[PDB]
Amino acid sequence: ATFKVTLINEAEGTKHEIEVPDDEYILDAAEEQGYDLPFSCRAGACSTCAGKLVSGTVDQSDQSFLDDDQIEAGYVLTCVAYPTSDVVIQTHKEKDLY
Ligand code: FES
């Protein structure tokens, strides 16, 4: 399957839509589609690529940085997240972390 992923940059007031394969991480699909997003480690072990879910679900089983409460709050490391449905997510949310 292929899921629609909506990227929202609150500070910039932008909204971009991408199509993401069920077996591709969101960050990779975004870049391929023309949208560069923040990243550093690209391995699920930092917070640079953090985003926050608005709706939809992801599989980010490979991540290691976020604690359970952060995940509960809707945080996602885009570099290692696969969409599991259509998703609405806010990007550039690193600063929200502590
Ligand atoms: S860039 Fe480090 S966890 Fe995604």
The domain made up of 1-98 is a member of CATH 3.10.20.30: yes
Sheet strand arrangement including 14-21? 14-21, 2-9, 87-90, 50-55, 75-77
Resolution (A): 1.8
| Three-state secondary structure string covering the chain | CEEEEEEEECCCCEEEEEEEECCCCHHHHHHHCCCCCCCCCCCCCCCCCEEEEEECCEECCCCCCCCHHHHHCCEEEHHHCEECCCEEEECCCHHHCC
For residue 27, which atom of ligand 1 is closest to its CA? 4
Mutate to test the pocket of ligand 1, among 26, 37, 48 (most ligand atoms within 8 A of CB): 48
- Token pair listed for 14: 């932008």
How determined?
A: X-ray
Domain boundaries, the chain: 1-98
36 is in an annotated binding site: no
